[PDB]
Amino acid sequence: HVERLQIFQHLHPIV
Amino acid sequence: YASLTEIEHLVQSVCKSYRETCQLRLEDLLRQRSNIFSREEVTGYQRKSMWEMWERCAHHLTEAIQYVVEFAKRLSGFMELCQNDQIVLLKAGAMEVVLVRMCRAYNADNRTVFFEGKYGGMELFRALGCSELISSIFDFSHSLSALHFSEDEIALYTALVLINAHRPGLQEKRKVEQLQYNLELAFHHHLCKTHRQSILAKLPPKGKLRSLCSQHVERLQ
Amino acid sequence: ASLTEIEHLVQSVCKSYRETCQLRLEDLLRQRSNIFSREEVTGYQRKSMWEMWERCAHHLTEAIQYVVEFAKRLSGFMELCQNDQIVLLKAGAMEVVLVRMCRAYNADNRTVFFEGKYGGMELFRALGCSELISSIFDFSHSLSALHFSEDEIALYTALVLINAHRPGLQEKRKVEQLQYNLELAFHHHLCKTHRQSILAKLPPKGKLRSLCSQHVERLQIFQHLHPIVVQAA
Numbered sequence: 001h002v003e004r005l006q007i008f009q010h011l012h013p014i015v
Numbered sequence: 016y017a018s019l020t021e022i023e024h025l026v027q028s029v030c031k032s033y034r035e036t037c038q039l040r041l042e043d044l045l046r047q048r049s050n051i052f053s054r055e056e057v058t059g060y061q062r063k064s065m066w067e068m069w070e071r072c073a074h075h076l077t078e079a080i081q082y083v084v085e086f087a088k089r090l091s092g093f094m095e096l097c098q099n100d101q102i103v104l105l106k107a108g109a110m111e112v113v114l115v116r117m118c119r120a121y122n123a124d125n126r127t128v129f130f131e132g133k134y135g136g137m138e139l140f141r142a143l144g145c146s147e148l149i150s151s152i153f154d155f156s157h158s159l160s161a162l163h164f165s166e167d168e169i170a171l172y173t174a175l176v177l178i179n180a181h182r183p184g185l186q187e188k189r190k191v192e193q194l195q196y197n198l199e200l201a202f203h204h205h206l207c208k209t210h211r212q213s214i215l216a217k218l219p220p221k222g223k224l225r226s227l228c229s230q231h232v233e234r235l236q
Numbered sequence: 237a238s239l240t241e242i243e244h245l246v247q248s249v250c251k252s253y254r255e256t257c258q259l260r261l262e263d264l265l266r267q268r269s270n271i272f273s274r275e276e277v278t279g280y281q282r283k284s285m286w287e288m289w290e291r292c293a294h295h296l297t298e299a300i301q302y303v304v305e306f307a308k309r310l311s312g313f314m315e316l317c318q319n320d321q322i323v324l325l326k327a328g329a330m331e332v333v334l335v336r337m338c339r340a341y342n343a344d345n346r347t348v349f350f351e352g353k354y355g356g357m358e359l360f361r362a363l364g365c366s367e368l369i370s371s372i373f374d375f376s377h378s379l380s381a382l383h384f385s386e387d388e389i390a391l392y393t394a395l396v397l398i399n400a401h402r403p404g405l406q407e408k409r410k411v412e413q414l415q416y417n418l419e420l421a422f423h424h425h426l427c428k429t430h431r432q433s434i435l436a437k438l439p440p441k442g443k444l445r446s447l448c449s450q451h452v453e454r455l456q457i458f459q460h461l462h463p464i465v466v467q468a469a
C-alpha cells in the first residue's frame with residue numbers, strides 16, 4: 001500500500 | 016447500466032482514459048528497443064550508491080503512480096465514490112497497476128526494461144541489493160509479455176485491478192461492486208468483440224499481483 | 237512542560253521550515269534587482285488565461301508539496317491518524333502558501349518573485365481577476381511590514397496548520413495538545429527574540445481563511461475545465 005497521504009497528494013495536488 | 020451499448024461506451028471511455036495517461040506511448044517504447052545501455056553505462060549504474068539508486072527509483076515510481084492516479088480519476092464512476100474509497104482503492108491497487116504497466120516497457124527478446132531513456136537488464140539495479148525482488152518482477156513482466164497485451168486490454172485489466180470491492184476499508188462497498196461488475200462485463204464483452212477471450216485463462220492468478228507488490232511495499236523511505 | 241522541551245520544539249519546527257522553505261531567503265533577496273522588463277510583462281499578459289492557469293497551478297502545486305513536507309516534519313504531526321492529517325492539510329495548506337508568499341514579495345516596488353524574476357501584479361492580467369490578485373499582493377505587503385524572520389514564519393505557519401478547530405477531526409484532543417505546545421513554542425520564542433510586538437499585528441485567523449476561500453472558488457472551476465499533473469520531490 002501507498003501511504004494514505006501520498007495517495008491524497010496524487011488525488012488532489014492543489015485541494 | 017442495463018444495456019450493451021452503455022457497456023461499449025464504458026469500454027471506449029476506459030480506453031481513452033488509459034491512452035491519455037499511459038505515460039509512455041507504446042509506439043515510442045517499441046522504436047526505443049534498439050536503444051540499450053552499453054557495458055560502461057550499466058557499470059556506471061552499478062557503482063552508484065543504493066541510496067542514489069533508490070532516490071532515482073523512488074522518483075520514477077512516484078511519477079508512475081501519479082499517472083495511475085490520473086487514470087483512476089478518469090474512470091467513469093471512480094470520482095463518484097466517496098473520498099475514503101478512492102483513497103482505499105488507490106493505496107491498495109496503484110502499485111499493482113504500475114507492475115502491470117511495466118510489461119509495456121519490457122522487451123522479452125533480451126529481458127531488458129526501459130529505464131531512464133534506454134533499455135537495460137536487471138543487473139542495472141545491482142546496487143539496490145534486491146536481486147530476488149528485481150528478478151521476481153522481470154519474470155512476471157516476462158509472463159505478461161507472452162499474452163501480447165493490447166493497450167485496450169491493459170486499460171480494461173488495470174481498471175479491474177483498481178476497482179476491486181474486496182479492498183478492506185471501503186465505506187460504500189456496494190457502489191464499488193456496481194463499478195466492478197460493469198467493468199468486468201466490459202472486459203469480457205470487449206474480449207469477445209476482438210476474439211481474445213483466450214487471455215482470460217492466461218492472466219496472472221489470484222493474489223499474484225498482491226503477493227508481488229506486498230513483497231515490495233516493505234521499504235524504509 | 238519544561239522550557240527545555242519548548243525550546244527544543246522551537247529548534248525543531250525551525251529546522252523543519254529551513255529544510256522545506258522551497259526558496260532560500262538569501263536567494264529571494266539577491267534576486268530583487270532581477271525584474272521583468274516591460275516586454276517580458278507584455279509577453280505574460282499576451283498569454284491565454286489557460287496557459288497562465290497551467291503555469292500558476294504548476295507553481296502552486298509545487299508550493300503545496302513543500303508545505304505538506306513541512307507538516308510531515310512537525311513534531312507529532314505524523315503521529316496523528318491519516319484522516320486528521322488530511323483534514324489539517326486541506327484546511328490549512330493554502331493559508332500557509334499565502335503566508336510563505338511574503339518572503340518572495342518585494343514591498344519596495346510591489347513585485348513578487350514569479351518564474352525566475354520579480355514582477356508586479358500586472359503580470360497576471362490574463363487571468364482576469366485583478367481583485368483577487370490585488371488582495372494577496374496587499375496582504376503580502378502588510379506582512380512584509382512586519383519583517384517576519386524565517387523562524388517567525390516557521391512557528392506561525394505551524395499554528396496555521398495545527399488547528400484543533402478544523403471540522404472533521406477525529407482526535408481533536410490530540411490536535412489540541414499539538415496546537416498548545418506549538419503556541420508555547422511560538423510565544424516563548426517571541427520573548428527570547430524580543431518580538432512579542434508582532435502578536436497583535438498578525439492577521440486574525442479569519443483573514444487568511446477568507447482570502448483563501450476567495451481563490452479556491454476560482455481554482456476549482458479552473459481545475460475541472462482542464463487539470464494538471466506535476467512531479468514531486
Ligand SMILES: CC(C)CCC[C@H](CCCC(C)(C)O)[C@H]1CC[C@H]2[C@@H]3CC=C4C[C@@H](O)CC[C@]4(C)[C@H]3CC[C@]12C
Pocket residue numbers: 037038039069072073075076079110113114116117118120128129143145148152227228231234
Ligand atoms: C512492485 C513494483 C512496481 C516496484 C517497483 C520496482 C522498481 C524498483 C524497486 C526498488 C525497491 C527498493 C522498491 O526494491 C521500479 C523502479 C523504477 C520503476 C519504473 C519507472 C517507470 C515506469 C514507466 C511506466 O509506464 C511502467 C512502469 C515503469 C517501467 C516502472 C517499473 C517499476 C520500476 C522499475
Ligand SMILES: CC(C)CCC[C@H](CCCC(C)(C)O)[C@H]1CC[C@H]2[C@@H]3CC=C4C[C@@H](O)CC[C@]4(C)[C@H]3CC[C@]12C
Pocket residue numbers: 257258259292293295296299330331333334336337338340348349363365368369372447448451452454455458
Ligand atoms: C496563496 C493563494 C491563496 C493564492 C494563489 C495566487 C497565485 C495564482 C492566483 C490565480 C487564481 C486564478 C487562483 O486567482 C499563485 C500562482 C503561483 C503562486 C506562487 C508560486 C510559488 C511561490 C513560492 C512559495 O515559496 C511562496 C508562494 C509563491 C510565491 C506562490 C504565491 C501564490 C502564487 C502567485
